[PDB]
Amino acid sequence: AVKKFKPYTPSRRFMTVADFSEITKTEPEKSLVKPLKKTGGRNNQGRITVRFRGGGHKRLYRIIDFKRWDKVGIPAKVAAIEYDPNRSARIALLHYVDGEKRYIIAPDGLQVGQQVVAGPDAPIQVGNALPLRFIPVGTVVHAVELEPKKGAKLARAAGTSAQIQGREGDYVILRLPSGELRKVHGECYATVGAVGNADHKNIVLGKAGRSRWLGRRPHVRGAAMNPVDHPHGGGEGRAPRGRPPASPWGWQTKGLKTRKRRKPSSRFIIARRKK
Amino acid sequence: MKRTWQPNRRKRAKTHGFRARMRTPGGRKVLKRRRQKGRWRLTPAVRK
RNA sequence: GCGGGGUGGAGCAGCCUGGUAGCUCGUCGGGCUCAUAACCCGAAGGUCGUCGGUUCAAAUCCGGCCCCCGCAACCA
RNA sequence: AAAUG
RNA sequence: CCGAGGGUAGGGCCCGUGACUGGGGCGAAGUCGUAACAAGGUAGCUGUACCGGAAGGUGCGGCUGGAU
RNA sequence: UGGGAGAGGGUGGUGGAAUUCCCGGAGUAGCGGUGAAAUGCGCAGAUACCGGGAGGAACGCCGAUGGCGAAGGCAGCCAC
RNA sequence: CGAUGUCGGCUCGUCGCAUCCUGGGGCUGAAGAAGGUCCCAAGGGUUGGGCUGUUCGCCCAUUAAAGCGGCACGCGAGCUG
RNA sequence: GAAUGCCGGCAUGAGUAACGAUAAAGAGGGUGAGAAUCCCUCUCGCCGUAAGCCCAAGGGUUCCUACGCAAUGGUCGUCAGCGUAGGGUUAGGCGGGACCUAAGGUGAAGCCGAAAGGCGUAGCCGAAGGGCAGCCGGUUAAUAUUCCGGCCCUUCCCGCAGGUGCGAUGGGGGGACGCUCUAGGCUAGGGGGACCGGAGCCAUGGACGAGCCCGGCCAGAAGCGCAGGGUGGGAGGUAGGCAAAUCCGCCUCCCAACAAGCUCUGCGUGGUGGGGAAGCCCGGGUGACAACCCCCCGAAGCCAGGGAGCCAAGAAAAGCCUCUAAGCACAACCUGCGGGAACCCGUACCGCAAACCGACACAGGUGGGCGGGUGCAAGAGCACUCAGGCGCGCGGGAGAACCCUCGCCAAGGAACUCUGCAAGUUGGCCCCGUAACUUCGGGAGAAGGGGUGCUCCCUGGGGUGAUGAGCCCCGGGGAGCCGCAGUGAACAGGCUCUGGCGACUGUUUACCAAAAACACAGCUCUCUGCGAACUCGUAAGAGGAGGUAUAGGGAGCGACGCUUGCCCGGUGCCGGAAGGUCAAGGGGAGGGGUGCAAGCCCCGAACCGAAGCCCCGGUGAACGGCGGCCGUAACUAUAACGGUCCUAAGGUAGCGAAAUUCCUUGUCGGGUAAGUUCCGACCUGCACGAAAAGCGUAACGACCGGAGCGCUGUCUCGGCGAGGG
RNA sequence: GAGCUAGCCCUGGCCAGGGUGAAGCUGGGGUGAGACCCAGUGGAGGCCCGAACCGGUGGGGGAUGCAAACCCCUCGGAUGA
RNA sequence: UGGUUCGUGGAGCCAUGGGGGAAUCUGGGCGGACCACCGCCUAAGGCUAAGUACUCCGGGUGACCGAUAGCGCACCAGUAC
Ligand SMILES: [Mg+2]
Ligand SMILES: [Mg+2]
Ligand SMILES: [Mg+2]
Ligand SMILES: [Mg+2]
Ligand SMILES: [Mg+2]
Ligand SMILES: [Mg+2]
Ligand SMILES: [Mg+2]
Ligand SMILES: [Mg+2]
Ligand SMILES: [Mg+2]
Ligand SMILES: [Mg+2]
Ligand SMILES: [Mg+2]
Ligand SMILES: [Mg+2]
Ligand SMILES: [Mg+2]
Ligand SMILES: [Mg+2]
Ligand SMILES: [Mg+2]
Ligand SMILES: [Mg+2]
Ligand SMILES: [Mg+2]
Ligand SMILES: [Mg+2]
Ligand SMILES: [Mg+2]
Ligand SMILES: [Mg+2]
Ligand SMILES: [Mg+2]
Ligand SMILES: [Mg+2]
Ligand SMILES: [Mg+2]
Ligand SMILES: [Mg+2]
Ligand SMILES: [Mg+2]
Ligand SMILES: [Mg+2]
Ligand SMILES: [Mg+2]
Ligand SMILES: [Mg+2]
Ligand SMILES: [Mg+2]
Ligand SMILES: [Mg+2]
Ligand SMILES: [Mg+2]
Ligand SMILES: [Mg+2]
Ligand SMILES: [Mg+2]
Ligand SMILES: [Mg+2]
Ligand SMILES: [Mg+2]
Ligand SMILES: [Mg+2]
Ligand SMILES: [Mg+2]
Ligand SMILES: [Mg+2]
Ligand SMILES: [Mg+2]
Ligand SMILES: [Mg+2]
Ligand SMILES: [Mg+2]
Ligand SMILES: [Mg+2]
Ligand SMILES: [Mg+2]
Ligand SMILES: [Mg+2]
Ligand SMILES: [Mg+2]
Ligand SMILES: [Mg+2]
Ligand SMILES: [Mg+2]
Ligand SMILES: [Mg+2]
Ligand SMILES: [Mg+2]
Ligand SMILES: [Mg+2]
Ligand SMILES: [Mg+2]
Ligand SMILES: [Mg+2]
Ligand SMILES: [Mg+2]
Ligand SMILES: [Mg+2]
Ligand SMILES: [Mg+2]
Ligand SMILES: [Mg+2]
Ligand SMILES: [Mg+2]
Ligand SMILES: [Mg+2]
Ligand SMILES: [Mg+2]
Ligand SMILES: [Mg+2]
Ligand SMILES: [Mg+2]
Ligand SMILES: [Mg+2]
Ligand SMILES: [Mg+2]
Ligand SMILES: [Mg+2]
Ligand SMILES: [Mg+2]
Ligand SMILES: [Mg+2]
Ligand SMILES: [Mg+2]
Ligand SMILES: [Mg+2]
Ligand SMILES: [Mg+2]
Ligand SMILES: [Mg+2]
Ligand SMILES: [Mg+2]
Ligand SMILES: [Mg+2]
Ligand SMILES: [Mg+2]
Ligand SMILES: [Mg+2]
Ligand SMILES: [Mg+2]
Ligand SMILES: [Mg+2]
Ligand SMILES: [Mg+2]
Ligand SMILES: [Mg+2]
Ligand SMILES: [Mg+2]
Ligand SMILES: [Mg+2]
Ligand SMILES: [Mg+2]
Ligand SMILES: [Mg+2]
Ligand SMILES: [Mg+2]
Ligand SMILES: [Mg+2]
Ligand SMILES: [Mg+2]
Ligand SMILES: [Mg+2]
Ligand SMILES: [Mg+2]
Ligand SMILES: [Mg+2]
Ligand SMILES: [Mg+2]
Ligand SMILES: [Mg+2]
Ligand SMILES: [Mg+2]
Ligand SMILES: [Mg+2]
Ligand SMILES: [Mg+2]
Ligand SMILES: [Mg+2]
Ligand SMILES: [Mg+2]
Ligand SMILES: [Mg+2]
Ligand SMILES: [Mg+2]
Ligand SMILES: [Mg+2]
Ligand SMILES: [Mg+2]
Ligand SMILES: [Mg+2]
Ligand SMILES: [Mg+2]
Ligand SMILES: [Mg+2]
Ligand SMILES: [Mg+2]
Ligand SMILES: [Mg+2]
Ligand SMILES: [Mg+2]
Ligand SMILES: [Mg+2]
Ligand SMILES: [Mg+2]
Ligand SMILES: [Mg+2]
Ligand SMILES: [Mg+2]
Ligand SMILES: [Mg+2]
Ligand SMILES: [Mg+2]
Ligand SMILES: [Mg+2]
Ligand SMILES: [Mg+2]
Ligand SMILES: [Mg+2]
Ligand SMILES: [Mg+2]
Ligand SMILES: [Mg+2]
Ligand SMILES: [Mg+2]
Ligand SMILES: [Mg+2]
Ligand SMILES: [Mg+2]
Ligand SMILES: [Mg+2]
Ligand SMILES: [Mg+2]
Ligand SMILES: [Mg+2]
Ligand SMILES: [Mg+2]
Ligand SMILES: [Mg+2]
Ligand SMILES: [Mg+2]
Ligand SMILES: [Mg+2]
Ligand SMILES: [Mg+2]
Ligand SMILES: [Mg+2]
Ligand SMILES: [Mg+2]
Ligand SMILES: [Mg+2]
Ligand SMILES: [Mg+2]
Ligand SMILES: [Mg+2]
Ligand SMILES: [Mg+2]
Ligand SMILES: [Mg+2]
Ligand SMILES: [Mg+2]
Ligand SMILES: [Mg+2]
Ligand SMILES: [Mg+2]
Ligand SMILES: [Mg+2]
Ligand SMILES: [Mg+2]
Ligand SMILES: [Mg+2]
Ligand SMILES: [Mg+2]
Ligand SMILES: [Mg+2]
Ligand SMILES: [Mg+2]
Ligand SMILES: [Mg+2]
Ligand SMILES: [Mg+2]
Ligand SMILES: [Mg+2]
Ligand SMILES: [Mg+2]
Ligand SMILES: [Mg+2]
Ligand SMILES: [Mg+2]
Ligand SMILES: [Mg+2]
Ligand SMILES: [Mg+2]
Ligand SMILES: [Mg+2]
Ligand SMILES: [Mg+2]
Ligand SMILES: [Mg+2]
Ligand SMILES: [Mg+2]
Ligand SMILES: [Mg+2]
Ligand SMILES: [Mg+2]
Ligand SMILES: [Mg+2]
Ligand SMILES: [Mg+2]
Ligand SMILES: [Mg+2]
Ligand SMILES: [Mg+2]
Ligand SMILES: [Mg+2]
Ligand SMILES: [Mg+2]
Ligand SMILES: [Mg+2]
Ligand SMILES: [Mg+2]
Ligand SMILES: [Mg+2]
Ligand SMILES: [Mg+2]
Ligand SMILES: [Mg+2]
Ligand SMILES: [Mg+2]
Ligand SMILES: [Mg+2]
Ligand SMILES: [Mg+2]
Ligand SMILES: [Mg+2]
Ligand SMILES: [Mg+2]
Ligand SMILES: [Mg+2]
Ligand SMILES: [Mg+2]
Ligand SMILES: [Mg+2]
Ligand SMILES: [Mg+2]
Ligand SMILES: [Mg+2]
Ligand SMILES: [Mg+2]
Ligand SMILES: [Mg+2]
Ligand SMILES: [Mg+2]
Ligand SMILES: [Mg+2]
Ligand SMILES: [Mg+2]
Ligand SMILES: [Mg+2]
Ligand SMILES: [Mg+2]
Ligand SMILES: [Mg+2]
Ligand SMILES: [Mg+2]
Ligand SMILES: [Mg+2]
Ligand SMILES: [Mg+2]
Ligand SMILES: [Mg+2]
Ligand SMILES: [Mg+2]
Ligand SMILES: [Mg+2]
C-alpha cells in the first residue's frame, strides 16, 4: 500500500514511503521506552568493527516482550498500533486486564481492540502465543523462541513468517523464512500469524539522503581503493578484479561457506536454506 | 588560517596534567625522568 | 631487432628421433538416374622455397639468400 | 532417408 | 489616432534538394538452398515469441480452408 | 407469482491418482532411448519393487454429435 | 649531472649567399610580350587569413615576390606554458 | 686554509629594497632642550549587520593616577598595551560549587591477562543540558544586577499557632523534548504628530511661521484587567507497577465536557522611585516645577509544554507532586507569622583584535547577543547617514620610462589567441510573449520585446479604528511637464545550436588537478538459523544488535529505458561416507646391542590410520577467453554457399578513424572565402562489445570540444588621462 | 600526541528576503458506482534566485610577500549527505 | 622446548608445558645413547654471614682541563628560549 510522489524534484521521482495506515497512535508509551545508545559501529575499544554505520536519526528504544510465557493465561486488549524505528515491524500496545502494559510485534491482520492471550490452551487465533507442540501443524507462526525460555529469536522482520511441517519427538519441524528446515523444541513458545507491514521491501529509498537518515554511511567499493587498503585496489585506469573476489580481509566473497563445521546445531538442522 | 594551537585550559590539564601522568606506567616514568633531570615544573602550568 | 612458416590443385600430418611421404576435398575413369548433384567401385598426381654443407644416405640435421605471416621498438 | 530440371 | 509598407524576433504548413541508408517495383535463360500446391515427403495456415546465411524452424494457443 | 436446468462468473475451503526430488528397507548388471543407434545414466549401487515425506500443476471414467455464456471462453468435490 | 631550463609562439633583431622579388648581364628551340637556364649582385623589401600545440605543410584572398638558412633547433634572470 | 665543516666576530650587496592596505588630509593655540607624530579647538575624509556595543574562550595587570624616554614602537615622541611607584576587582538573588545526570571516564561485586595491566552491572565523577531566589537608578580617576537609594524574593535553624497518618536513596506521575509551516494577543523596537516642554535662531532674495531645532520615557510588590498554558470530578472492584500502598495502571457505574471552576505564567495598570535634551556657560552647571500625551508599522522574542501537517519517529537523572514501609505518632510533615542564619571561587582590562591562535603592534583565523534612519519591490543586499569609533605609528616634493589598479576612444568587430584567457554586452520589478524534445515536473528568467521619472484631476479595495476621520498598505483610468538618457547614482544573468562524458544535489588530492574520478539511490551474485557470519582484542569482552533472512556482513555495476549471447578445458568456489595418496599414533612379522642368565635397550615389513591433494561432477551479474588459410555468382568487384586445419568454445544484439584508428589530415557530405579540430555517414574495429556492463536517454554540469548572434582595447595599433609605486 | 586534520558519540546554536506551487482537503462536473477533469484553499522539495555562514571555478596581483597558501574581480552550495 | 661449548648431532646430564604414572635402602639419581661390571651421591622443604658489584653522598690524590677546554651549568641551569 505504498505511496509515490510526482517527480517535482529529481530525487523525489522514484521515492516511495509506507502508507502508515494501521498506525493508531502518534507517540509511544512513556513507561515502556529507554534510550538507544548509538554505537556508530565502534566497540568498547573505540575501534570501528563494522564500517560505514552511524549518523542516523535519533531514536528511543521501545521495550518488547519476547517472552509471553511470562504472563500465561492473562488476556489483553489490543490497545493501539505504533511505529517503531528500531525494527522493520510495526508494534502493538497491549493493555492487560492485569493492568500491566506491554508491546509486541504487530502481526499482519491484527486489528485494534481484540483479545490476545498466551497459554498452552490459548485459542488458535492471530496474536495468541502458544508452545510449538500445542500449535496445529501447517499453521503460520512467528516470534519463535529458538530454545525454551530464552526469548523469541526467529521471524521478527516485516512480513516474515514460519511454517510447521511436522513433529518428531519432543521437537517440531519448521520452515524458516530463509527456507531452512530445523528441529525446534516443542516447549519453545511462538506467536501465530505473519508479521505485519509486509510491504516494507517495496520501499524505494530515492536518494542518498535516506541512506544517511537511517544510519547507513556511504559504502565505497574496493576497486576504488589502493593496494594497502583493499585487495582489489590499485591498477592503472579502471581495472577488473584480477583475483577471486575477496573481502577486505582476504577471504573470498563468492560462494565461500563460512559456517563452522563442527557446530552442534548441525544435528538439529534438516535442510540448508533454499535458493 | 586556523593554526595548530587553539588553547583550552580544561584540555591541557586533563591531557598533560599531573593526575593524568600518575595513572599510566608511562606517565609515572615521565615524572621520574623529569625529576632526575631536575626540571623546575613536572607538568605544564594552567590557572584553572 | 626477436619467433614461427614454405611439401600434389586447395587446407593440413610427417621435421622433434634421417632411410618408408600420409589425411580430407578436389581432378580423372566407370557405375545408378530421363538427366545433375548426392552416393558406390577404381585411378592418377608431391623429387618437400632455393642454394651450400655434413653424412653411406636429407622433406627431415647445420649454414646463407627470397618470400609469408606474427611480436617488439621502452626512460628521455 | 532422399534435392533440383 | 489609424495606416500601405519596411526592419527585427520566434513559430506553423507545403514544395524542391542532400553524403548515406531502408525496403520495394520491374528487368529470357547468375549463384545457394527446397519452404508451399500429393499426407510435398515434419499436415497446412494463422496470431505471438525467441533463434537462423536465406526461404523458414521451434514454443504456447487457435482454425480445417487436413488427408487417411 | 411459482418453479426447472446448466463446465456461466468471483472468493474461500477441500480429494485422490500420477510425475519428479529426498530419507529408509530390500536387491544387482544395466537402465534408458530410436527407423536402427548414440549423447545421458549406472558398482560412488541406478533401472524395476516396498514403506515414509515434501511440492507444484491438471482434474480419468462420468462425457456425449451433450449443456452454459453476447463473445474470448468455462469440466474433481463442498460452500458463500 | 654540488643543474648548461628542454618544442612551438610573441617581442627584438643581426649575419651568411646556394637569391624569391626588385637591379645588371650571357645563352636561348629569344618574333614581340612573356618564359626557360646560367653569371654578377645581400642595398632595401619579402602581405593578411583558415586548420592543427605544432616546426613543416595544405587551403582561401592578394602580391613586384610571398627565398633558404646561422647565431645553444637565436632569444624563459623578457613573456606566454 | 679549505670538509656547501663547528662557534664567534666584522664586511659586501647599500645609503639601494622596504617602513605592512590608496579610508586623507589642513590650519591655529598649548607644553617642552627638542614636535608633521603628545594635548585642546575649528575645517575635511572613512566604516556604520561596523572599523559601534555587550558576553563566552583564551591572555594575565596590559585598567586608572603620578613621575620618566636607554631600549621596545618598522621615522620622530613630551605619547603609549614600554620602564618605576602607588592605587584598583566587594554579591544569599549574575556564573560555578555544597543538586542532577548524557557521551565518556572511573569502578564495591565479578570476569580476564607472563608482569605492567585490559574489561565490567550498581555506585561516583563529568555541562554551554535540567533545576534554582533581582529589577531600575545613582556614585568612583578606575569596580558594580556586587557599594548606595527605592521597591521585591529564596533556603536553612528556632519558636509559635492552624491542618493532616507523618515518614524514602523504594513505587507512580511529572520533568520529557524532532523537522517544516503557523493562529491569536502583547512586549522589545521604530515612524509621525498643527498636541504638550524647551534654550534659542530670522541669516543671503523670501519666511514671525500650524517655521526651524531639541525632547516628549524606565522599573514597580498585593489587587485588578486583557491574552494564553495546564488539569476532568466521584464510587466500586483489582490478581499489575519484584514488600506494602488510598497513588498509578486496567475494568464497571454516576455527574461534567469548545465550557465553568481551580492552578502557573506573559503583558497592561498599579503605592511609589528615578531618568530627563538641543542650546548656552566653565566632566560638571543651567536650560526646568521641563513636558512626559495621541495615532500608525511591528517582530525570528514573550504567553508556551500553542495549533496543524509530515516521516527519518524525535536524551537521562534531580528538583516538584503523590503513594505507602519499617519507624513514630510528647513526635514528624505541611501552611502561616515572629525572631535569628546565609559559606568557598570568579568580577579590573583586551575581547573580529596592537593585549587571544599565527615567531612581529601581521591586510589571514576565532563561537553567541543588539545592531538605528531614508530610499531602492523586498532584505542582515547596495548607497548616504545617528549614537558611537577611526584616518590603519615615517613624511615632504617632483608629474620621466616601467609595473600595479581604474576610466575613455575615431573606423573595423575575434582578423588576437592553444581557447573570446581577460575585459565588454546582459543586468532589478512590472506586463505581453516563448521552440525542439520529455521521464509531463520540465526545458523556461528559454528566446525576444514594451514599460519604468515627476505634476493635476477622477476612482476601487484592505488594515487600524467604530462603521467615520486620521494614519497605513495595495492598486485603476484621463490629461500634461522636463532631459541625451526615468530600476537617471550603488548593489543585480549575455544568449542560442550541436557533440563526448557522468544520471541527478552532492565528495576528494588542507597547500599546483573539483574532473570524465568517489559517493548515491537501483540491479545481481554470495555469505550467515543466533552464543549468527564478519570485525577489534592473546583472553575477558565488546561491536553486529538489546537486530533475527522484508534482517545482517562481503563483491561488482551504478537513475531509468531496451538488453546482457557462446565456452566450465585450466584457476577459484560448491557438491561428491567409492578408490588412490597421505604424518602422528596404533601395529610388532622380522632383526640388533649387551648380560652366564631372569632381563634391560634400540631398529623395524605388511596391515588399521583425518583434513588436504589426485579423481567424478556443478558453476560466469565467479578469475578469464571468444580462430586461420583457400575457392566460387552470365562484366568486373565482393562472396549469402562451399573446402580444410584447429579450438574448451570461436564476438550474437548494439556501436564503431571513437576519451579506443598505427598507417591518418582514411574516404564522402555538411558548415567556412579557405575547417589535421567539430558535426553526419561509410567500415579492412593495427587493438569496441555486453554488469572492470553494451546502446540510448528528458533534466542537471564554475567538466571537455565545435558553431552563430550580440558587445567589446583580444587584435590591426596604438593614444591620452587618474591614482599607488 | 586527535587543542591541526579525518570519523563517530553526548549536548546546545545559526541559515535575512524572495520565487516556484506536489500531495491532501472543500466545492463543482461526471459515473451504476468509480477513475478522472476544472477553480479554490493548501505550502511539499538532497527545488530555483540570492546575503550571512561553509566553499575555492577562472583570471590578475603577490614570489626575501600583509601572509611558510594572502588580496581583488569573478564563480558553486546556501532546510540539507 | 630451554640452559650448558653442545645449531638433532651417537645427545646424556639440569630445568619442564602435555600424557602415563613407582619405590622407602635389598629404596633411588649420576659417571654423555644403551648393557654389564665397578664406583659416586641421597632428589622432590627452608635459612646462612665473610670474600665480590655500584658511587647520589664525604675525603685524599693526579706527567687530568683551564672559561669554544673541563659536567650541559665555575656566574641564580636543567634556567632563558
Ligand atoms: Mg580509552
Ligand atoms: Mg591502514
Ligand atoms: Mg593486498
Ligand atoms: Mg587488482
Ligand atoms: Mg584503479
Ligand atoms: Mg586499461
Ligand atoms: Mg573465515
Ligand atoms: Mg607555532
Ligand atoms: Mg576549534
Ligand atoms: Mg572551557
Ligand atoms: Mg626553584
Ligand atoms: Mg631453409
Ligand atoms: Mg641438399
Ligand atoms: Mg541449384
Ligand atoms: Mg501596421
Ligand atoms: Mg508589417
Ligand atoms: Mg530451432
Ligand atoms: Mg423467479
Ligand atoms: Mg533408495
Ligand atoms: Mg558413461
Ligand atoms: Mg555401470
Ligand atoms: Mg447458446
Ligand atoms: Mg656551480
Ligand atoms: Mg634541467
Ligand atoms: Mg659572394
Ligand atoms: Mg653569387
Ligand atoms: Mg642554381
Ligand atoms: Mg632579376
Ligand atoms: Mg636572361
Ligand atoms: Mg606536418
Ligand atoms: Mg602566409
Ligand atoms: Mg632569420
Ligand atoms: Mg639541431
Ligand atoms: Mg599543459
Ligand atoms: Mg594554466
Ligand atoms: Mg689542505
Ligand atoms: Mg651557499
Ligand atoms: Mg658557492
Ligand atoms: Mg640616494
Ligand atoms: Mg643597486
Ligand atoms: Mg631604485
Ligand atoms: Mg624606495
Ligand atoms: Mg585600491
Ligand atoms: Mg602643530
Ligand atoms: Mg600620521
Ligand atoms: Mg577570564
Ligand atoms: Mg604624564
Ligand atoms: Mg625609536
Ligand atoms: Mg605602565
Ligand atoms: Mg542581595
Ligand atoms: Mg555547608
Ligand atoms: Mg551524580
Ligand atoms: Mg576484584
Ligand atoms: Mg586494575
Ligand atoms: Mg577501565
Ligand atoms: Mg544550565
Ligand atoms: Mg544562580
Ligand atoms: Mg569599565
Ligand atoms: Mg545599573
Ligand atoms: Mg543593594
Ligand atoms: Mg499504619
Ligand atoms: Mg502521606
Ligand atoms: Mg521517579
Ligand atoms: Mg502573530
Ligand atoms: Mg517605520
Ligand atoms: Mg516620537
Ligand atoms: Mg518631533
Ligand atoms: Mg512649543
Ligand atoms: Mg534677507
Ligand atoms: Mg538636523
Ligand atoms: Mg509600567
Ligand atoms: Mg482553561
Ligand atoms: Mg475517572
Ligand atoms: Mg478503590
Ligand atoms: Mg493491586
Ligand atoms: Mg505489590
Ligand atoms: Mg483505584
Ligand atoms: Mg483519587
Ligand atoms: Mg507587570
Ligand atoms: Mg533646577
Ligand atoms: Mg523658561
Ligand atoms: Mg496591531
Ligand atoms: Mg532567532
Ligand atoms: Mg516556546
Ligand atoms: Mg506543540
Ligand atoms: Mg540512564
Ligand atoms: Mg542520583
Ligand atoms: Mg510498626
Ligand atoms: Mg567589565
Ligand atoms: Mg573579520
Ligand atoms: Mg562577534
Ligand atoms: Mg585595541
Ligand atoms: Mg600598526
Ligand atoms: Mg591583525
Ligand atoms: Mg599579535
Ligand atoms: Mg533591525
Ligand atoms: Mg536597515
Ligand atoms: Mg526601507
Ligand atoms: Mg525616487
Ligand atoms: Mg553593507
Ligand atoms: Mg560623528
Ligand atoms: Mg575598536
Ligand atoms: Mg593606534
Ligand atoms: Mg567624458
Ligand atoms: Mg574603439
Ligand atoms: Mg563607435
Ligand atoms: Mg557588429
Ligand atoms: Mg593569427
Ligand atoms: Mg572553443
Ligand atoms: Mg585552456
Ligand atoms: Mg571570459
Ligand atoms: Mg527549434
Ligand atoms: Mg508546458
Ligand atoms: Mg527576459
Ligand atoms: Mg524629475
Ligand atoms: Mg551518438
Ligand atoms: Mg570526439
Ligand atoms: Mg556528476
Ligand atoms: Mg590540491
Ligand atoms: Mg546500496
Ligand atoms: Mg532477488
Ligand atoms: Mg582471535
Ligand atoms: Mg566471545
Ligand atoms: Mg553481544
Ligand atoms: Mg544484502
Ligand atoms: Mg564504475
Ligand atoms: Mg557505466
Ligand atoms: Mg556475460
Ligand atoms: Mg572455463
Ligand atoms: Mg572449472
Ligand atoms: Mg572440495
Ligand atoms: Mg608409525
Ligand atoms: Mg649371548
Ligand atoms: Mg582422506
Ligand atoms: Mg582462460
Ligand atoms: Mg567470376
Ligand atoms: Mg560483427
Ligand atoms: Mg576484437
Ligand atoms: Mg543475441
Ligand atoms: Mg565510455
Ligand atoms: Mg571534408
Ligand atoms: Mg565544403
Ligand atoms: Mg571559426
Ligand atoms: Mg583536442
Ligand atoms: Mg577501410
Ligand atoms: Mg570496452
Ligand atoms: Mg575488453
Ligand atoms: Mg564482463
Ligand atoms: Mg554511449
Ligand atoms: Mg548509460
Ligand atoms: Mg527514452
Ligand atoms: Mg546525453
Ligand atoms: Mg556539482
Ligand atoms: Mg561549450
Ligand atoms: Mg590595450
Ligand atoms: Mg599609460
Ligand atoms: Mg600617475
Ligand atoms: Mg593516549
Ligand atoms: Mg576532533
Ligand atoms: Mg546572527
Ligand atoms: Mg523565509
Ligand atoms: Mg529561503
Ligand atoms: Mg516568510
Ligand atoms: Mg513566498
Ligand atoms: Mg518570479
Ligand atoms: Mg489539510
Ligand atoms: Mg472530490
Ligand atoms: Mg491542488
Ligand atoms: Mg498562497
Ligand atoms: Mg547561479
Ligand atoms: Mg543559490
Ligand atoms: Mg572556518
Ligand atoms: Mg575542502
Ligand atoms: Mg582563489
Ligand atoms: Mg595565481
Ligand atoms: Mg607561495
Ligand atoms: Mg556566491
Ligand atoms: Mg543549483
Ligand atoms: Mg540534519
Ligand atoms: Mg639449545
Ligand atoms: Mg646445522
Ligand atoms: Mg655433530
Ligand atoms: Mg638440546
Ligand atoms: Mg630424599
Ligand atoms: Mg634439603
Ligand atoms: Mg669503576
Ligand atoms: Mg665524590
Ligand atoms: Mg694545563
Ligand atoms: Mg694551573
Ligand atoms: Mg663551557
Ligand atoms: Mg679567556
Ligand atoms: Mg666567548
Numbering used by the authors:
A (entry chain 1D): 2 to 276
B (entry chain 17): 1 to 48
Task: Provide passages from the article that reported this PDB entry.
Here, we need to note that the ribosome structure in complex with A-site CC-Pmn has been reported previously at ∼1Å-higher resolution. The only reason why we determined it again is to validate the accuracy of our structural models determined at 3.7Å resolution. For this purpose, we compared our 3.7 Å-resolution structure of the 70S/CC-Pmn-complex with similar or identical structures that were determined previously at 2.4–2.8 Å resolution. Our comparison revealed no significant differences in the location and orientation of the CC-Pmn molecule on the 70S ribosome between the new and the previous structures. In all analyzed structures, the L-mTyr was tightly fit into the A-site pocket due to shape complementarity between the ribosomal A-site and the amino acid backbone. Our electron density maps revealed that, in both crystal structures, the CCA-ends of aminoacyl-tRNA analogs establish canonical contacts with the A-loop, illustrating that the presence of D amino acid residue does not impede recognition of the CCA-end by the ribosome. The electron density maps revealed the backbones of both L- and D- amino acids, as well as the entire side chain of the L-methyl-tyrosine. In case of L-amino acids, the α-amino group (such as the one in CC-Pmn) forms a hydrogen bond (H-bond) with the 2′-hydroxyl of the nucleotide A76 of the P-site tRNA (black dotted line), which plays critical role in (i) its positioning for the optimal nucleophilic attack onto the carbonyl carbon of the P-site substrate and (ii) the subsequent shuttling of the protons (solid arrowhead).
During protein synthesis, ribosomes discriminate chirality of amino acids and prevent incorporation of D-amino acids into nascent proteins by slowing down the rate of peptide bond formation. To provide structural insights into the poor reactivity of the D-aminoacyl-tRNAs in the peptide bond formation we determined the crystal structure of T. thermophilus 70S ribosomes in complex with hydrolysis-resistant analogs of aminoacyl-tRNAs. Using either of these compounds as an A-site substrate, we determined their crystal structures in complex with the T. thermophilus 70S ribosomes carrying messenger RNA and tRNAifMet in the P site.
